[PDB]
Amino acid sequence: IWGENLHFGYWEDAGADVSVDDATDRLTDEMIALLDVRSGDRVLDVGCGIGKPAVRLATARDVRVTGISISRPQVNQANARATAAGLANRVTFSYADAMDLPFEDASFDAVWALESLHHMPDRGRALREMARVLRPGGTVAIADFVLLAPVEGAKKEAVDAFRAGGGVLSLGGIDEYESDVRQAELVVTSTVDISAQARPSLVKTAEAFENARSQVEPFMGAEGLDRMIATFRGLAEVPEAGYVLIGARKP
Numbered sequence: 001i002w003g004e005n006l007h008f009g010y011w012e013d014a015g016a017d018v019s020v021d022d023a024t025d026r027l028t029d030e031m032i033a034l035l036d037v038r039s040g041d042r043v044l045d046v047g048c049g050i051g052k053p054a055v056r057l058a059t060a061r062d063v064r065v066t067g068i069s070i071s072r073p074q075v076n077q078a079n080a081r082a083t084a085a086g087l088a089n090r091v092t093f094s095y096a097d098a099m100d101l102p103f104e105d106a107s108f109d110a111v112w113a114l115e116s117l118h119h120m121p122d123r124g125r126a127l128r129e130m131a132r133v134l135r136p137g138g139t140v141a142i143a144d145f146v147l148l149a150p151v152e153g154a155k156k157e158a159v160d161a162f163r164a165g166g167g168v169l170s171l172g173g174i175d176e177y178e179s180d181v182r183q184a185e186l187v188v189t190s191t192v193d194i195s196a197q198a199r200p201s202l203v204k205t206a207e208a209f210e211n212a213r214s215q216v217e218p219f220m221g222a223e224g225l226d227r228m229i230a231t232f233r234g235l236a237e238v239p240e241a242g243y244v245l246i247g248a249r250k251p
């Protein structure tokens with residue numbers, strides 16, 4: 001239930017009143033730049049959520065996006081959002097699992113995964129499927145949260161809590177993400193630790209929900225809403241809790 005409810009953002013100032021929606025859009029902008037895409041390419045987006053990132057990509061570059069998810073409501077919302085921005089000709093969404101993708105080999109010019117791989121019960125599988133469907137010359141972009149070091153006591157306690165409510169089936173170090181990418185026979189072009197920029201998202205979104213307590217409360221219940229706010233505030237204070245951007249390429 002804390003899965004499709006937290007979207008990390010890119011924060012730079014320490015001292016500018018930008019919205020949670022502002023920081024999320026900036027992060028997306030780093031991913032757009034990190035894919036390396038030009039007029040006429042095709043892009044696969046794995047774990048599309050409700051479609052915001054894919055619509056932003058389409059507003060920025062002239063490409064075909066297809067988005068993928070294992071939650072039926074989300075596919076319907078994403079498609080409505082696409083049809084609503086008039087991008088139905090090129091932006092489209094369907095229901096499929098990244099552990100077994102139903103696409104032709106070498107279909108896409110590019111692929112991306114924004115905050116989705118930590119759900120997969122096995123990152124390797126997913127990345128292998130992703131390489132299998134990119135054409136040689138094709139590029140990849142990953143954005144996800146990581147554990148920079150092993151933890152204990154109350155630090156481990158605050159991390160576990162987060163994984164429970166967000167369904168984080170596999171959390172790992174950067175070094176682990178890298179060799180997962182290398183196993184799929186992709187070449188790694190950049191890896192950047194953006195912890196310091198991503199961190200503020202946690203307290204800042206705890207605040208947002210608070211402001212909306214009486215309008216979200218009936219959907220989640222009081223105690224559920226409280227545990228989610230508490231769990232973010234705990235995670236914010238464990239500095240072993242990190243975030244990384246990774247670009248990669250197919251020989």
Ligand SMILES: Nc1ncnc2c1ncn2[C@@H]1O[C@H](CSCC[C@H](N)C(=O)O)[C@@H](O)[C@H]1O
Pocket residue numbers: 003004007046047048049050051052053068069070071074096097098099114115116119120
């Ligand atoms: N095994 C899997 N295969 C394909 N999609 C999956 C998956 N496991 C989880 N997902 C989907 O991936 C998403 C992860 S949350 C990612 C949010 C999205 N990037 C956004 O900001 O809009 C969820 O929508 C979830 O339904």
